[PDB]
């Protein structure tokens, strides 16, 4: 059976700063010691390094996964870092500085491009589940869909432009959720105007405009797109059913049922949501200093782990080999992350054939052929 962890961070950090505890046991696995984290500012890099932003300050820390102490490498930026996100494959680390979308490369360590189209701060940054598109949104009520192909191989005198410009909200964005896929995925942007819209990343069209009662501050979706758990600004965790589908494009929550589709038990905002793999336990942070697991099938609480201070980042992962093992020295050291705009790839060969070794019957047949040829 697999193992599921729940990474949690607090905005006060008296003793620890990123506690990793087992889901169905509640016991700690790994802790970390250092500066305070930042909202939407945690991202595991290649399953080896736990990069984290800093609250207010302008730089990014870096913890090796099997090490309780901060490393001596600090990514530095020319302005207050707002959000961070590492690409799923692990090749690119992409962060947002004020209104810029600084993009790095893990292999060489260079700073490829500095994209800049938002008119105000950038407050959410997500990567499509195949690292082909990355969606960025900010406090200017704009959600843009970039493309990792066009923004990388663009001429230095071409000023790359976003593939899609989604401008339907009337208030700052707060969270996004790009599902699996690629050029066929679906985004679930949510703003402060009490709406949660589900877009399409292939053609760029609206599909749903659920309008809630309180401002939405976090949206997560089931991996098969069956439920859309939208957080609230008062504590409730509303739930939309995408497979019932009453059959319109601009719904409203109260006509879409109530009191049987609302998780309740929180007393302040919920700026964190994540659904487990199978889709039976939901982990939600808050601002009332509590991270609690729900029971999506029965809308009941399970445990009420209480942190210190507001909860910034909280998510459910599938525990890699890193956390299970005890030493796991990283394959490659983290390079020197540049802060100025610009061959030489640094990589380990012999990984495109891992396991492509001859089978027992193949070797036996080759040996028998050699014997027969020698006999003649």
């Amino acid at each position: 059976a697999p193992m599921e962890v729940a990474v949690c961070t607090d905005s006060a950090a008296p003793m620890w700063s990123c506690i990793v505890w087992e889901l169905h046991s509640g016991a700690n696995l790994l802790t970390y010691r250092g500066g305070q984290a930042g909202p939407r500012g945690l991202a595991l890099l290649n399953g080896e390094y736990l990069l984290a932003a800093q609250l207010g300050k302008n730089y990014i820390s870096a913890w090796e996964l099997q090490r309780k102490d901060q490393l001596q490498q600090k990514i530095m930026c020319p302005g207050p870092v707002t959000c961070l996100t590492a690409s799923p494959n692990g090749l690119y680390v992409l962060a947002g500085v004020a209104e810029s979308i600084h993009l790095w490369e893990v292999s060489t360590g260079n700073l490829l491009v500095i994209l800049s189209r938002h008119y105000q701060d950038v407050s959410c940054l997500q990567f499509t589940g195949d690292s082909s598109h990355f969606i960025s949104g900010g406090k200017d009520c704009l959600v843009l869909v970039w493309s990792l192909c066009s923004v990388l191989q663009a001429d230095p005198s071409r000023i790359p432009a976003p593939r899609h410009v989604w401008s339907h909200h009337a208030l700052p964005i707060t969270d996004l959720h790009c599902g699996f896929g690629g050029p066929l995925a679906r985004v679930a942007t949510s703003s402060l105007d009490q709406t949660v819209k589900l877009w399409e990343v292939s053609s760029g069209e609206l599909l749903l405009s659920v309008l809630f009662d309180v401002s939405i501050m976090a949206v997560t979706m089931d991996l098969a797109e069956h439920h859309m758990f939208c957080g609230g600004s008062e504590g409730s965790i509303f739930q939309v059913d995408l497979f019932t589908w009453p059959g319109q494009r601009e719904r409203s929550f109260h006509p879409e049922q109530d009191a049987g589709k609302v998780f309740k038990g929180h007393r302040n905002q919920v700026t964190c949501l994540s659904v487990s793999t199978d889709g039976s336990v939901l982990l939600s942070g808050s601002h009332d200093e509590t991270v609690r697991l729900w029971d999506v099938q029965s809308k009941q609480c399970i445990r009420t782990v209480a942190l210190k201070g507001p909860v910034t980042n909280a998510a459910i992962l599938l525990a890699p080999v890193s956390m299970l093992s005890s030493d796991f020295r990283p394959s490659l050291p983290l390079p020197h992350f540049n802060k100025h705009l610009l061959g030489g790839l640094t990589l380990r060969l012999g990984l495109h054939q891992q396991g492509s070794e001859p089978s027992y019957l193949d070797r036996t047949e080759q040996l028998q052929a050699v014997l027969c040829s020698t006999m003649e």
Binding site: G56, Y119, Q120, C141, V165, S167, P172, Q194, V214, Q269
Partner: protein, 539 residues
């Protein structure tokens, strides 16, 4: 000409013949102009890339020189020629000569266009838009933008022309996402126009609020200054631009409060007065409080000093003045009146209760939930409770007559913000006791057909405040003298005692003071039969 080929087959047939007529025209005055008309007619009849490129590459030679007309030579003659010439991608470098002189012509007609009718003016506007689109260099478009703005600023224009110009400009602003001084100077004059246009043209005001919202979404610093300057006028309770417009355009204009740079005491007060009264719907009263909370100092974010200007004291003043929402002038006038068949009078509690219509009470009870939630999130509950107690002891205890809405809302705040560390002052208890007794008398004596639905809420609030604090119950029981109370109020006090006896939660705090229960009972004798037996309750 319905088929594409039938129209195309007609194309090569006629136009060479009108060129023959074009030479015969000039080596009357209609001749050439009618030839100009039918070409555009069929060009429009086209609306494609291959066919338009075919016409371009096949008739460039003729159109360059033979199709020229008398520019100096009331202006449609040259206007149609300019339209078709512009209607003929990336060929600006090979055509800059006639592009430049056509730009000069369109600027010349734009500058002095005052008596021009709507149709050819729209055609000229489209021609100018296509001219700036085909030449996307800022320096060349600056002069055209200046000319069209000077047309926009002429001393008196008809409404359709103004609407068309505003639509074109909108379609010149709502594309920047795809900072000219002349473009941004017209933007600054939009909030003043919106403030002046109260209710005459709702559609124009909707367009204005849409463009203002779009521009403020990009922090255009030449607009936010004027918006902050006119925020006082545009947000006004009595008359303004938040309460007089329909329910649709008053949602964007309350969501716009987020982008407002600074919120001083004046704007905050006249915005609280906008949301307390019945002018604004209760649905759009939680949105405003949520926005003001998200722009407050306890949201969780930190940004520029000028914004986030909810400097604690002003935020608490706004929250209190919307919790006990009633203006000072109307409250003082209400205090002035004395003696109506609308106000409950009591000789035992020196506080009277002014009665309110059902709609006002329902609105004030549906708007106070947001205040409850906003005042519940505040960290360090003791400090905000102390601030609330100071506000109550400064603005409410000295009052003689209090409304039936505040008497419930303040009790709700007190019973919702109470915890272990909270401590109630000693100069506040008598006011609470008097208000509680007057409220109970009001609930007991309810004899129009409207003031009956506001009973369960008030009874729940009263029982909750009675249960949470026992000192107010003790004070009310102590201040239950019957010697001064006349025979008119003899049965009501007994009914109140019976009802208090019946209810279960008010038992532990009640049986402690048992002597005062009998002391009033014997004085009552000097309906009563039930009270005497009811001392021992299910025991």
């Amino acid at each position: 000409l319905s088929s594409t080929e039938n129209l195309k087959g007609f194309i090569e047939i006629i136009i060479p013949l009108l060129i023959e007529c074009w030479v015969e025209a000039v080596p009357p005055l209609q001749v050439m102009q009618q030839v100009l008309n039918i070409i555009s007619l069929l060009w429009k009849l086209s609306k494609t890339h291959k066919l338009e490129s075919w016409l371009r590459k096949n008739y460039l030679i003729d159109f360059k020189h033979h199709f020229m007309s008398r520019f100096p030579y009331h202006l449609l003659l040259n206007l149609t020629l300019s339209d078709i010439m512009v209607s003929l991608a990336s060929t600006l470098q090979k055509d800059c000569s006639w592009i430049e002189m056509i730009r000069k012509f369109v600027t010349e007609t734009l500058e002095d266009g005052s008596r021009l009718n709507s149709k050819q003016l729209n055609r000229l506007l489209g021609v100018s838009w296509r001219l700036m689109q085909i030449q996307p260099n800022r320096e060349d478009t600056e002069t055209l933008i200046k000319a069209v703005y000077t047309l926009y600023q002429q001393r008196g224009l008809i409404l359709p022309v103004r609407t068309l110009l505003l639509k074109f400009f909108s379609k010149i602003y709502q594309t920047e996402e795809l900072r000219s001084k002349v473009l941004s100077r017209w933007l600054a004059g939009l909030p003043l126009q919106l403030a002046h246009l109260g209710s005459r043209n709702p559609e124009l005001s909707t367009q204005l609020i849409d463009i203002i919202h779009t521009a403020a979404a990009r922090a255009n610093k030449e607009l936010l200054k004027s918006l902050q300057a006119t925020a006082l006028r545009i947000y006004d309770p009595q008359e303004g631009a938040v309460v007089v417009l329909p329910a649709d355009s008053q949602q964007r204009l309350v969501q716009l409060v987020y982008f407002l740079p600074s919120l001083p005491a004046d704007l905050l007060s006249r915005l609280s007065r906008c949301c307390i009264m019945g002018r604004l719907s209760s649905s759009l009263a939680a949105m405003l409080i949520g926005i003001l909370h998200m722009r407050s100092s306890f949201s969780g974010w930190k940004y520029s000093a000028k914004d986030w200007l909810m400097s604690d004291v002003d935020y608490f003043s706004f929250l209190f003045s919307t919790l006990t929402g009633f203006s000072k002038e109307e409250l003082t006038w209400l205090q002035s009146l004395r003696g109506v068949p609308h106000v409950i009078q009591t000789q035992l509690s020196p506080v009277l209760l002014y009665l309110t219509d059902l709609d006002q009470f329902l609105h004030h009870w549906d708007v106070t939930e947001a205040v409850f939630h906003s005042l519940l999130v505040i960290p360090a509950r003791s400090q905000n409770f102390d601030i609330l107690q100071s506000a109550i002891s400064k603005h409410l205890v000295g009052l003689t007559v209090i409304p039936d809405s505040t008497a419930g809302c303040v009790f709700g705040v007190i019973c919702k913000l109470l915890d272990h560390t909270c401590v109630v002052s000693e100069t506040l208890l008598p006011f609470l006791a008097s208000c509680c007794y007057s409220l109970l008398y009001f609930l007991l004596t309810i004899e129009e057909a409207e003031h009956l639905r506001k009973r369960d809420k008030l009874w729940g609030v009263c029982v909750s405040i009675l249960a949470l604090l026992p000192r107010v119950l003790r004070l009310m029981l102590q201040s239950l003298r019957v010697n001064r109370v006349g025979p008119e109020e003899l049965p009501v006090v007994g009914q109140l005692l019976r009802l208090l006896l019946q209810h279960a939660p008010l038992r532990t705090h009640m049986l402690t003071n048992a002597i005062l229960v009998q002391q009033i009972i014997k004085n009552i004798t000097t309906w009563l039969t039930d009270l005497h037996y009811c001392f021992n309750v299910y025991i």
